[PDB]
Scaffold this motif. Structure first.
Motif, PDB file in Angstrom:
ATOM      1  N   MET C 343       0.826  -1.204   0.000  1.00 21.95           N
ATOM      2  CA  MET C 343       0.000   0.000   0.000  1.00 21.95           C
ATOM      3  C   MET C 343       0.861   1.255   0.000  1.00 21.95           C
ATOM      4  O   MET C 343       0.516   2.250  -0.648  1.00 21.95           O
ATOM      5  CB  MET C 343      -0.960   0.008   1.196  1.00 21.95           C
ATOM      6  N   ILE C 344       1.988   1.228   0.713  1.00 19.82           N
ATOM      7  CA  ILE C 344       2.868   2.391   0.749  1.00 19.82           C
ATOM      8  C   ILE C 344       3.374   2.715  -0.650  1.00 19.82           C
ATOM      9  O   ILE C 344       3.425   3.883  -1.053  1.00 19.82           O
ATOM     10  CB  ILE C 344       4.031   2.151   1.730  1.00 19.82           C
ATOM     11  N   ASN C 345       3.762   1.690  -1.410  1.00 21.48           N
ATOM     12  CA  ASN C 345       4.283   1.918  -2.751  1.00 21.48           C
ATOM     13  C   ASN C 345       3.209   2.407  -3.713  1.00 21.48           C
ATOM     14  O   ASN C 345       3.541   2.901  -4.795  1.00 21.48           O
ATOM     15  CB  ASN C 345       4.922   0.637  -3.292  1.00 21.48           C
ATOM     16  N   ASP C 346       1.935   2.278  -3.353  1.00 25.51           N
ATOM     17  CA  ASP C 346       0.843   2.804  -4.159  1.00 25.51           C
ATOM     18  C   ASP C 346       0.473   4.233  -3.783  1.00 25.51           C
ATOM     19  O   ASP C 346      -0.501   4.767  -4.322  1.00 25.51           O
ATOM     20  CB  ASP C 346      -0.392   1.909  -4.026  1.00 25.51           C
ATOM     21  N   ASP C 347       1.223   4.860  -2.876  1.00 23.54           N
ATOM     22  CA  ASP C 347       0.900   6.202  -2.395  1.00 23.54           C
ATOM     23  C   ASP C 347       2.217   6.913  -2.103  1.00 23.54           C
ATOM     24  O   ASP C 347       2.790   6.741  -1.024  1.00 23.54           O
ATOM     25  CB  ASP C 347       0.016   6.132  -1.158  1.00 23.54           C
ATOM     26  N   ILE C 348       2.688   7.710  -3.063  1.00 25.89           N
ATOM     27  CA  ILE C 348       3.981   8.366  -2.899  1.00 25.89           C
ATOM     28  C   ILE C 348       3.936   9.367  -1.753  1.00 25.89           C
ATOM     29  O   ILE C 348       4.902   9.501  -0.993  1.00 25.89           O
ATOM     30  CB  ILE C 348       4.421   9.032  -4.214  1.00 25.89           C
ATOM     31  N   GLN C 349       2.824  10.089  -1.608  1.00 25.28           N
ATOM     32  CA  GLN C 349       2.728  11.070  -0.532  1.00 25.28           C
ATOM     33  C   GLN C 349       2.871  10.418   0.835  1.00 25.28           C
ATOM     34  O   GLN C 349       3.310  11.071   1.788  1.00 25.28           O
ATOM     35  CB  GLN C 349       1.403  11.825  -0.615  1.00 25.28           C
ATOM     36  N   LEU C 350       2.496   9.143   0.960  1.00 23.29           N
ATOM     37  CA  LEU C 350       2.686   8.440   2.223  1.00 23.29           C
ATOM     38  C   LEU C 350       4.092   7.875   2.345  1.00 23.29           C
ATOM     39  O   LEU C 350       4.596   7.714   3.461  1.00 23.29           O
ATOM     40  CB  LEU C 350       1.659   7.316   2.362  1.00 23.29           C
ATOM     41  N   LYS C 351       4.735   7.564   1.219  1.00 19.34           N
ATOM     42  CA  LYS C 351       6.128   7.134   1.264  1.00 19.34           C
ATOM     43  C   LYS C 351       7.019   8.257   1.774  1.00 19.34           C
ATOM     44  O   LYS C 351       7.950   8.020   2.551  1.00 19.34           O
ATOM     45  CB  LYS C 351       6.575   6.677  -0.123  1.00 19.34           C
ATOM     46  N   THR C 352       6.741   9.493   1.352  1.00 21.95           N
ATOM     47  CA  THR C 352       7.548  10.626   1.791  1.00 21.95           C
ATOM     48  C   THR C 352       7.396  10.865   3.286  1.00 21.95           C
ATOM     49  O   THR C 352       8.364  11.224   3.965  1.00 21.95           O
ATOM     50  CB  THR C 352       7.162  11.882   1.015  1.00 21.95           C
ATOM     51  N   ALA C 353       6.186  10.684   3.819  1.00 18.83           N
ATOM     52  CA  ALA C 353       5.974  10.907   5.245  1.00 18.83           C
ATOM     53  C   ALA C 353       6.800   9.940   6.080  1.00 18.83           C
ATOM     54  O   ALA C 353       7.366  10.324   7.110  1.00 18.83           O
ATOM     55  CB  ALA C 353       4.491  10.771   5.583  1.00 18.83           C
ATOM     56  N   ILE C 354       6.883   8.679   5.654  1.00 17.60           N
ATOM     57  CA  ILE C 354       7.687   7.704   6.386  1.00 17.60           C
ATOM     58  C   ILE C 354       9.157   8.095   6.350  1.00 17.60           C
ATOM     59  O   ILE C 354       9.861   8.018   7.364  1.00 17.60           O
ATOM     60  CB  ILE C 354       7.463   6.292   5.817  1.00 17.60           C
ATOM     61  N   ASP C 355       9.648   8.514   5.183  1.00 15.31           N
ATOM     62  CA  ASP C 355      11.047   8.912   5.072  1.00 15.31           C
ATOM     63  C   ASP C 355      11.352  10.101   5.974  1.00 15.31           C
ATOM     64  O   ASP C 355      12.404  10.141   6.622  1.00 15.31           O
ATOM     65  CB  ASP C 355      11.383   9.243   3.619  1.00 15.31           C
ATOM     66  N   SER C 356      10.446  11.076   6.033  1.00 14.84           N
ATOM     67  CA  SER C 356      10.649  12.235   6.890  1.00 14.84           C
ATOM     68  C   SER C 356      10.554  11.893   8.368  1.00 14.84           C
ATOM     69  O   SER C 356      10.885  12.741   9.201  1.00 14.84           O
ATOM     70  CB  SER C 356       9.633  13.321   6.555  1.00 14.84           C
ATOM     71  N   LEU C 357      10.099  10.691   8.713  1.00 13.06           N
ATOM     72  CA  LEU C 357      10.167  10.220  10.088  1.00 13.06           C
ATOM     73  C   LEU C 357      11.486   9.527  10.390  1.00 13.06           C
ATOM     74  O   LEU C 357      11.970   9.601  11.524  1.00 13.06           O
ATOM     75  CB  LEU C 357       9.016   9.255  10.373  1.00 13.06           C
ATOM     76  N   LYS C 358      12.073   8.851   9.400  1.00 11.73           N
ATOM     77  CA  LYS C 358      13.369   8.214   9.606  1.00 11.73           C
ATOM     78  C   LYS C 358      14.441   9.248   9.927  1.00 11.73           C
ATOM     79  O   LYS C 358      15.264   9.045  10.828  1.00 11.73           O
ATOM     80  CB  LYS C 358      13.750   7.409   8.366  1.00 11.73           C
ATOM     81  N   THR C 359      14.443  10.369   9.202  1.00  8.35           N
ATOM     82  CA  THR C 359      15.409  11.426   9.478  1.00  8.35           C
ATOM     83  C   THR C 359      15.217  11.987  10.879  1.00  8.35           C
ATOM     84  O   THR C 359      16.191  12.305  11.569  1.00  8.35           O
ATOM     85  CB  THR C 359      15.284  12.540   8.445  1.00  8.35           C
ATOM     86  N   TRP C 360      13.965  12.125  11.313  1.00  9.64           N
ATOM     87  CA  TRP C 360      13.714  12.599  12.667  1.00  9.64           C
ATOM     88  C   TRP C 360      14.288  11.635  13.693  1.00  9.64           C
ATOM     89  O   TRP C 360      14.901  12.059  14.676  1.00  9.64           O
ATOM     90  CB  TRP C 360      12.213  12.789  12.879  1.00  9.64           C
ATOM     91  N   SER C 361      14.113  10.329  13.478  1.00  9.86           N
ATOM     92  CA  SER C 361      14.670   9.355  14.410  1.00  9.86           C
ATOM     93  C   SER C 361      16.192   9.423  14.431  1.00  9.86           C
ATOM     94  O   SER C 361      16.810   9.359  15.501  1.00  9.86           O
ATOM     95  CB  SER C 361      14.202   7.948  14.040  1.00  9.86           C
ATOM     96  N   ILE C 362      16.814   9.558  13.258  1.00  2.00           N
ATOM     97  CA  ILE C 362      18.269   9.651  13.202  1.00  2.00           C
ATOM     98  C   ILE C 362      18.755  10.881  13.958  1.00  2.00           C
ATOM     99  O   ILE C 362      19.731  10.817  14.712  1.00  2.00           O
ATOM    100  CB  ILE C 362      18.750   9.665  11.740  1.00  2.00           C
ATOM    101  N   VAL C 363      18.092  12.023  13.760  1.00  2.00           N
ATOM    102  CA  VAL C 363      18.525  13.247  14.428  1.00  2.00           C
ATOM    103  C   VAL C 363      18.264  13.164  15.925  1.00  2.00           C
ATOM    104  O   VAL C 363      18.987  13.766  16.728  1.00  2.00           O
ATOM    105  CB  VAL C 363      17.837  14.473  13.804  1.00  2.00           C
ATOM    106  N   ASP C 364      17.223  12.434  16.330  1.00  2.00           N
ATOM    107  CA  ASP C 364      16.969  12.248  17.755  1.00  2.00           C
ATOM    108  C   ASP C 364      18.054  11.394  18.395  1.00  2.00           C
ATOM    109  O   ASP C 364      18.544  11.711  19.486  1.00  2.00           O
ATOM    110  CB  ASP C 364      15.595  11.613  17.966  1.00  2.00           C
ATOM    111  N   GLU C 365      18.442  10.301  17.733  1.00  2.00           N
ATOM    112  CA  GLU C 365      19.499   9.451  18.268  1.00  2.00           C
ATOM    113  C   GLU C 365      20.849  10.154  18.254  1.00  2.00           C
ATOM    114  O   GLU C 365      21.678   9.921  19.141  1.00  2.00           O
ATOM    115  CB  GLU C 365      19.581   8.150  17.471  1.00  2.00           C
ATOM    116  N   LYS C 366      21.087  11.010  17.260  1.00  2.00           N
ATOM    117  CA  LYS C 366      22.392  11.647  17.121  1.00  2.00           C
ATOM    118  C   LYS C 366      22.722  12.528  18.318  1.00  2.00           C
ATOM    119  O   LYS C 366      23.900  12.750  18.616  1.00  2.00           O
ATOM    120  CB  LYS C 366      22.429  12.462  15.828  1.00  2.00           C
ATOM    121  N   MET C 367      21.705  13.036  19.016  1.00  2.00           N
ATOM    122  CA  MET C 367      21.944  13.906  20.161  1.00  2.00           C
ATOM    123  C   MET C 367      22.426  13.143  21.387  1.00  2.00           C
ATOM    124  O   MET C 367      23.145  13.717  22.212  1.00  2.00           O
ATOM    125  CB  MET C 367      20.670  14.677  20.513  1.00  2.00           C
ATOM    126  N   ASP C 368      22.052  11.877  21.525  1.00  2.00           N
ATOM    127  CA  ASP C 368      22.466  11.081  22.676  1.00  2.00           C
ATOM    128  C   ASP C 368      23.924  10.658  22.545  1.00  2.00           C
ATOM    129  O   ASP C 368      24.807  11.491  22.345  1.00  2.00           O
ATOM    130  CB  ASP C 368      21.571   9.849  22.823  1.00  2.00           C
TER     131      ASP C 368
END
Lengths: 379, 50, 368, 50
Positions: C343-368
């Motif tokens: 389903m994600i691959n059938d909705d690009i706008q939802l694929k982008t939202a997931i990617d923009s969450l991965k970067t948030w997780s990386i930046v959150d971990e980078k501070m620790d």
């Protein structure tokens, strides 16, 4: 008193509406509201618009004499009409109007661009042009002159005794135009009076046109509200062409003046109306001023056809209903050996190549031919 | 040719007030549509003479 | 004074108009003619209309589900609410209504269209639409029925900790269901707060939902003309989930309530708005009680985001603009209960939202 | 992906009458667009912490 209903409501809008509306401007919005709600044609012409609209009424007025068609989305030059001021300026096809003097007219709709371009009949406007060859805009000054755009033209048909008369709009000399056109061709045996899609206006010339043919007819077939306004008399019997075959072409556009010249002929059975149903605009509008010399345009009378029926909300129901299209043909090989081989002033007369493009004109010519055959049967 | 468009002829605040040849068999072929039309013009011309 | 102009105009109308119009009808066609010209949303209800509206209630009148709002002088369907007959009938946001039944819609009031759609749900009704990328209009025969489908679900994503909460419409239970889902699905982190196609809803529940993720203060500042009616909703300190990443999605068919949740987060840098521009419908109107039985309706006050911008026509401009489609999973080769990669691959706008969450997780971990 | 608009400024753009990446190239390749979209989120998370 009676104004309580509007005086109380207009008090609320003074305080509770978001954008601090001034009561001075509210009346400017209430008047425009009232007139637009009486019917589909009333309008308010305030002081600023009053004289401008009065001067630029139907007829000739200063302008540029350039056809706009948005060919490329940049106000391309569609038709540098022959003899118009733009043609005097030497404008060429392929140019587009990015700006007039310093303003990007492309970002504005033609609704106000046309107003800007159509200024004083003498004061020249420095039109700005852009050509792809030269990146910087060129300059072409169109000196002002009243634009003489005839509404009626008469052109013979190449292979038939039948004329073709176009009637778009109505100018002061519509009747004279058609009459002189017929005089130019005394041997015509039928006229395709094409008034297709023509909205109307200038009733005083529609009556003259119809009177040019009918012999008993009606003088002005309208009644109105007050008894004094009715004028449903008889037309004079000085019509020269009282037996010339006719076939008037109508279309959904024809509303008021083309709906009384076509409808009047139909009820006297003096012509055959060919085309598609019409607009059914059975009303007239007087531009009566009030207050500070501002025309409160409003409907004042309802046109009635001679038979007594009403055109309003009913159309004209052409006898031969046919919609635009192309005439079918059957062929297996090119009539010419090649498109460029074996073939060894265009407006001067209609030719079959343009007739075949419009099935309705072909149907009109067919109806005229049937009329001619029927008339010859009485010998 | 058949009608294809539905124009806004009337708007808001408007004023008020088997065993026979069917229009389908007239429509499918044009040669019979123009022959009936050429009869209508004859009727009109006849009515013009009372 | 100025009233003299109007008196002269009405006297002239009463003297020349064809149909012998009565004065009482002139005022009913002057007030009604003013409010419509004042602002599209405004409307006029006389004694009979006001009484019938008072007797009326939002009960069995489920209707087609179409939501309509004025734009460039024509009625446009903001978005059909999810699960309603209009959605199942193929009506899409951005379509301009032309006719309901045989009644042409040229210059109606929004209230008129709303009432036309309202009624007994089972009553058939026809609609005509103009689609931008399809010649000639359409026709839709639609049977209406009451809808009880819960407006939000918190379906979890398959192979990642991130949730996915779809706020279809802001009903009275929207804020409770989201909180319950988050509580019942702990240790999830990211949250794709999908708002595409959500026309709007109760403001009380938009602030109620935004309250979860914010502690700072002002959420939405509402101002009109006078100071007495001006008020703002400042979120209290109770923010159970003030840390987890978010990525809301907004699409051209969202407005009003879904536009204050997205706008509140954006102005507090509390989430990443992803999608297209918003419809921008953020004004407020209520029936004016002092009306001598002829209740009227005007845009008393409009909404202002905390940044100071107004969303009445501007709308919300997403941080990461990306249009609909299918992700380009091709060319890398020779050729239900939880969101799945299909389903994600059938909705690009939802694929982008997931990617923009991965970067948030990386930046959150980078501070620790 | 292309937006719903078909022409917009597709023809007769003209107007405007190299050393930096322009939006045309970002549109050309999706990987760089994703890279840029993943830098904006970093800025958002940087703002939030302050």
């Amino acid at each position: 008193h009676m104004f309580s209903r509007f005086s109380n409501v207009v008090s609320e809008i003074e305080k509770k509406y978001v954008d601090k509306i001034s009561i001075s401007e509210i009346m400017t919005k209430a008047i425009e509201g009232l007139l637009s709600n009486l019917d589909a044609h009333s309008a308010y012409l305030n002081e600023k618009k009053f004289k401008e609209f009065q001067a630029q009424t139907e007829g000739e007025f200063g302008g540029l004499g350039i056809t706009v068609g948005m060919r490329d989305g940049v106000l391309t030059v569609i038709a540098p009409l022959e003899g118009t001021p733009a043609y005097k300026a030497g404008v060429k096809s392929g140019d587009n109007i990015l700006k007039i003097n310093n303003e990007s007219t492309l970002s504005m709709s033609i609704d106000d661009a046309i107003n800007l371009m159509r200024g004083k009949p003498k004061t020249p406007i420095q039109i700005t042009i852009v050509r792809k060859n030269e990146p910087k805009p060129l300059v072409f000054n169109i000196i002002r002159d009243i634009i003489k755009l005839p509404s009626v033209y008469v052109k013979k048909i190449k292979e038939t005794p039948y004329l073709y008369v176009r009637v778009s709009g109505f100018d002061k000399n519509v009747t004279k135009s058609v009459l002189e056109g017929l005089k130019a061709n005394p041997k015509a045996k039928g006229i395709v009076l094409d008034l297709r899609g023509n909205p109307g206006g200038l009733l005083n010339q529609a009556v003259g046109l119809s009177n040019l043919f009918i012999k008993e007819g009606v003088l002005v077939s309208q009644k109105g509200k007050n008894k004094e306004e009715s004028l449903e008399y008889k037309a004079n019997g000085r019509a020269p062409y009282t037996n010339l075959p006719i076939a008037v072409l109508v279309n959904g556009g024809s509303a008021s003046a083309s709906e009384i010249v076509a409808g009047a002929l139909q009820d006297h059975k003096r012509a055959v109306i060919i085309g598609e149903k019409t607009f059914g605009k059975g009303s007239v509008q007087m531009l009566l001023p009030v207050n500070k010399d501002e025309a409160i345009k409003i409907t004042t009378a309802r046109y009635y056809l001679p038979s007594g029926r009403t055109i309003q909300a009913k159309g004209i129901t052409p006898d031969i209903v046919i919609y635009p299209g192309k005439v079918p043909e059957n062929e297996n090989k090119f009539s010419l050996k090649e498109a460029d081989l074996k073939h060894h002033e265009e407006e001067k007369e209609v030719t079959p190549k343009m007739i075949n493009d419009d099935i309705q004109l072909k149907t009109a010519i067919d109806s005229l031919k049937t009329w001619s055959i029927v008339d010859e049967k009485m010998d």
